[PDB]
Design a protein around this ligand. Structure first.
Ligand code: ADP
Lengths: 519, 59, 370, 59
């Protein structure tokens, strides 16, 4: 254990220690952080004191991309909170956690179980300080993973868990084989990692579905959704002969998907091949090139997966909720950390921007606390805000002329290529920014295309393929198809005087939402 | 008077309905036959396009 | 802050917000004034009706288009139409929105000067901009190269683009469009007995044109076929019963686009002016122009117009080029779609004409710079 | 009683008439759409066949 100014640096010991148990050490009750030995339980007690003495919500931000130490630390702190403000809520949390483990985790090139989303546990307290039920909140998800995967990686486990050929009832209900190389949305990188078995994962997930209030339909339907997303991966279309219009060739996968989701094959095919718009008070069809329809298919799969995920989140939050009216809570913000790999890509840019925002947030916090302390001792000393200004210049990415802005601009721009994108970037930022610099590509490494100076060093990125990552033209016709499907889970998902949606936009807005949640 | 008037004119309405239904069935036959013939025609066109592109490559 | 896109046109106003997929408001560009006495005291009679309110009351009104051939010839009526578009159709405040207006190429400069002066003074837009309809149509087609043939209600024009460079010396503008076809059809229907003389009857004939007319692939044998059998005759029902049946008029009306001598014009058909605009371009880009003819506007919506166009241009061009007529299914709103795309670009936010620039330079800035 | 029963049966039969007319016009417009396109592509086939013959002469 270690104190660092305002942080709390702890190291995983790999060794059982009674430094946590029994309460003989958990006697920190009433103390401050400065006087006791530097234990995180003292931090949790300080959080208790603060939330009780100011009636203000508190926040816990741990770095999480470390494989272990995240798990045990979360467990021990939530156990501490269970103890202080006293089949427990911790049991309840770790019961259905396989849901999140199987949906929001996949093998990363430098990991084997990585949370690709943010976990923000809200553990609630009574008006006087007795623990209440706890509702967890999830946030932005790396949903581009649904379609595209780099080499030596793979998307979310649940696909491979199912594909483990464990329960043939599923693989037959979904009319699906066991070869992963036949379904493209998962077979881009590696089909399996030998560091884990998938049968035990499927069984853990089945147990999680059972302990949850899921019925036969609330399990087989999710399996159907995943199977249909996988059968999307090999939908094939051709230009109509002599003209510019996508035409289908083979409808086997279309039959599978129409049967699965409770849809029509012809209706699906035409609504994909003939989008329609509400023009004033009228309806007119739109023509489509093949690539546009493929964009539509990918966006459909992404939205299906995302809303299914969110609905399971709400289901779990309900299943762990039964309690009298409450007021106050403590925020437990788990989040991925910074990434510096040997081949950085767009998703890494997103994650680095998220971490940039969080770090500037922390810097603002420490800045204001230090300024307070300096006002306290009558110590006259003023300075440029350490919290915002030094980093406000490295968020060019958010200014609607910066990197991601120009990215969407090109996404809408016709015939836009990665070379044209690089040209526009260099026009707008080369030399006019100090943080924007040209990468040093020395033969022996993969080529980068630009370099930014973050707080975590100077990062280099390779812009190849980013238009495919950011474009999300949603097809409202198939949305209407979904909103009527016989598969009741589909309708429950999509119950509630379009062609422009970008992953960058939604990512940025969810980030700002979480920032407002914190501030 | 009004009842028998409505009776007669709306039986004639049903007669026009017989006419329109007959012509609708005829138009369904026309549509299906035409789309089948024109699927045959599109087979001819795709085949002759293959022919022309192959043969012009050779040329 | 979002921006407004207000493709005006001479027959239909299409407005909406920059960033949508289709215009939010589409109504006729028409102003109606009461024609008869008015006897019911207390009915609250208005002075004038605009948009499609003037269309449902058209039985008692005299309708006037404030735009004749792409040129705004009545500025009070145009002000009424803009006021309606902003306040009753879109329900916004023009003081909080840049506005992207649109204009046909090669029409008087006073048109744009008055447009920008009207906007900045009687609406207090923060900024505005006047695009060219063909460029926006090309934006919406997802291309950077091609000869676009726009054909709305007032004017038909070709603009050849290459790699994003316009060839302003090859722009060809023609003044027969939807409205002249409507008038020709009003004149041709009299030889069967039907007489439409009122402006409301002109609207009726416009609807007949939009529902029953098509472009014949071969005009002469189509004429002979219509003479021989009677399978080309359809029927239309006026809004009082009284059905009418038309025969060869169906394809004699839009044929005027290919033989403008039917209405006593000396110009050439749209196929021939397209070919001439191409042959006025540098010999290196015309092979790529031949394969990117982009059709746009309402008057290009007749059934069979793309096939006839391709047949004619193929007969004109050398026998080695690949003529491709690109006719999207939503080509009637291509100008608005492209306008929204354009007004949404990040690199465009410096092209607006801010209020301050106008205050410095007068209304003459619109073409002097932008 | 007779009169109103007749009127109601009649109005239902007529409200089926109207949809029959709509489906009839839809069928005939689809059939003419088809046949017109089919003869246009028939002309296209004629052109490509003439090119096929000229190309045979070239071969
Ligand atoms: N389906 C159709 N078939 C043939 N002509 C049409 C059709 N729809 C509209 N038009 C013609 O297009 C004109 C309106 O086209 P539009 O592009 O809106 O004109 P503008 O661009 O000047 O507003 C009308 O005059 C009408 O005659």
């Amino acid at each position: 254990y270690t104190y660092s100014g305002l942080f709390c640096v702890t190291v995983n010991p790999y060794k059982w220690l009674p430094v946590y148990n029994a309460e003989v050490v958990a006697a920190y009750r009433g103390k401050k952080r400065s006087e006791a030995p530097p234990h995180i339980f003292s931090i949790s007690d300080n959080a208790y004191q603060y939330m009780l003495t100011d009636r203000e919500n508190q926040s816990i931000l741990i770095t999480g991309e470390s494989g272990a130490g995240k798990t045990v630390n979360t467990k021990r702190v939530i156990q501490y909170f269970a103890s202080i403000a006293a089949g427990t809520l911790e049991d309840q949390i770790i019961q259905a956690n396989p849901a999140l483990e199987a949906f929001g985790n996949a093998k990363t090139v430098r990991n084997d179980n990585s949370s690709r989303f943010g976990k923000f546990i809200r553990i609630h307290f009574g008006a006087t300080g007795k623990l209440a039920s706890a509702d967890i909140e999830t946030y932005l998800l790396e949903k581009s993973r649904v379609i595209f995967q780099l080499k030596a990686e793979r998307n979310y486990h649940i696909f491979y868990q199912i594909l483990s050929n464990k329960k043939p009832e599923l693989l037959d209900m979904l009319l699906v084989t066991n070869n992963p190389y036949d379904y493209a949305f998962v077979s881009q990188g590696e089909v399996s990692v030998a560091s884990i078995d998938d049968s035990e994962e499927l069984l853990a997930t089945d147990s999680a579905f059972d302990v949850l209030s899921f019925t036969a339909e609330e399990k087989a339907g999710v399996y159907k959704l995943t199977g249909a997303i996988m059968h999307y991966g090999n939908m094939k279309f051709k230009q109509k002969q002599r003209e510019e219009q996508a035409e289908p060739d083979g409808t086997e996968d279309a039959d599978k998907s129409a049967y699965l989701m409770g849809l029509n094959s012809a209706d699906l095919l035409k609504g994909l091949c003939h989008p329609r718009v509400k023009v004033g008070n009228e309806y007119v069809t739109k023509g489509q090139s093949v690539q546009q329809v493929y964009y539509s298919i990918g966006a459909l799969a992404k939205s299906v997966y995302e809303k299914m995920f969110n609905w399971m989140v709400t289901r779990i939050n309900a299943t762990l909720e039964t309690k009298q009216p409450r007021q106050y809570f403590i925020g437990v913000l788990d989040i991925a950390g910074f990434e510096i790999f040997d081949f950085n890509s767009f998703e890494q840019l997103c994650i680095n921007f998220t971490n940039e925002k969080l770090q500037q947030f922390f810097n603002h916090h420490m800045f204001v606390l230090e300024q307070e302390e300096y006002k306290k001792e009558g110590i006259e000393w003023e300075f440029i805000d350490f919290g915002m200004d030094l980093q406000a210049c490295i968020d060019l990415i958010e200014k609607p002329m910066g990197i991601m802005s120009i990215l969407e601009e090109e996404c809408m721009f016709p015939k836009a290529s990665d070379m044209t994108f690089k040209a526009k970037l260099y026009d707008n930022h080369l030399g006019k920014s100090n943080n924007f610099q040209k990468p040093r590509n020395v033969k022996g490494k993969q080529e980068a295309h630009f370099s930014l100076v973050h707080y975590a060093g100077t990062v280099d990125y390779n812009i190849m393929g980013w238009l495919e990552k950011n474009k999300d033209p949603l097809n409202e016709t198939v949305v209407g198809l979904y909103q009527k499907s016989s598969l009741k889970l589909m309708a429950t998902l999509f119950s509630t005087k379009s062609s422009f949606q970008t992953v960058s936009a939604l990512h940025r807005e969810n980030l700002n939402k979480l920032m407002t949640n914190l501030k | 008077h009004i009842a028998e008037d409505a009776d007669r004119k709306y039986e004639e309405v049903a007669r026009k309905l017989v006419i329109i239904e007959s012509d609708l069935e005829r138009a369904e036959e026309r549509a299906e036959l035409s789309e089948g013939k024109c699927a045959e025609l599109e087979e001819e066109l795709k085949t002759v396009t293959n022919n022309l592109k192959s043969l012009e490559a050779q040329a | 802050t979002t921006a407004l896109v207000c493709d005006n046109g001479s027959g239909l106003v299409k407005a909406g917000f920059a960033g949508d997929d289709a215009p939010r408001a589409v109504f006729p560009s028409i102003v109606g004034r009461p024609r008869h006495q008015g006897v019911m005291v207390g009915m609250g009679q208005k002075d004038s009706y605009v948009g499609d309110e003037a269309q449902s009351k058209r039985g008692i009104l005299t309708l006037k288009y404030p735009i004749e051939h792409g040129i705004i010839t009545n500025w009070d009526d145009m002000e009424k139409i803009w006021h309606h578009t902003f306040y009753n159709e879109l329900r916004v405040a023009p003081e909080e929105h840049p506005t992207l207006l649109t204009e046909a190429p090669l029409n008087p400069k006073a048109n744009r000067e008055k447009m920008t002066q009207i906007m900045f003074e009687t609406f207090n837009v923060p900024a505005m901009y006047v695009a060219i309809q063909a460029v926006l149509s090309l934006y919406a087609s997802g291309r950077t190269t091609g000869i676009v043939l726009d054909s709305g209600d007032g004017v038909t024009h070709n603009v050849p683009i290459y790699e994003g460079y316009a060839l302003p010396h090859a722009i060809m503008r023609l003044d027969l469009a939807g409205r002249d076809l409507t008038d020709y059809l009003m004149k041709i229907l009299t030889e069967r007995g039907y007489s439409f003389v009122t402006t409301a009857e002109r609207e009726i004939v416009r609807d007949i044109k939009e529902k029953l007319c098509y472009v014949a692939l071969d005009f002469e044998n189509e004429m002979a076929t219509a003479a021989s059998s009677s399978s080309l005759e359809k029927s239309y029902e006026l809004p009082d019963g009284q059905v009418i049946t038309i025969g060869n008029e169906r394809f004699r009306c839009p044929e005027t686009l290919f033989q403008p001598s039917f209405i006593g014009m000396e110009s050439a058909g749209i196929h021939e002016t397209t070919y001439n605009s191409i042959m006025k371009c540098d010999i290196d880009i015309r092979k790529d122009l031949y394969a990117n003819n982009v059709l746009s506007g309402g008057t290009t919506m007749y059934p069979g117009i793309a096939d006839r166009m391709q047949k004619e241009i193929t007969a004109l061009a050398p026998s080695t080029m690949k003529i491709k007529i690109i006719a999207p299914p939503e080509r009637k709103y291509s100008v608005w779609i492209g306008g929204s795309i354009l007004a949404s670009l990040s690199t465009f936010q410096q092209m607006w004409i801010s209020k301050q620039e106008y205050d410095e330079a007068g209304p003459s800035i619109v073409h002097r710079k932008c």
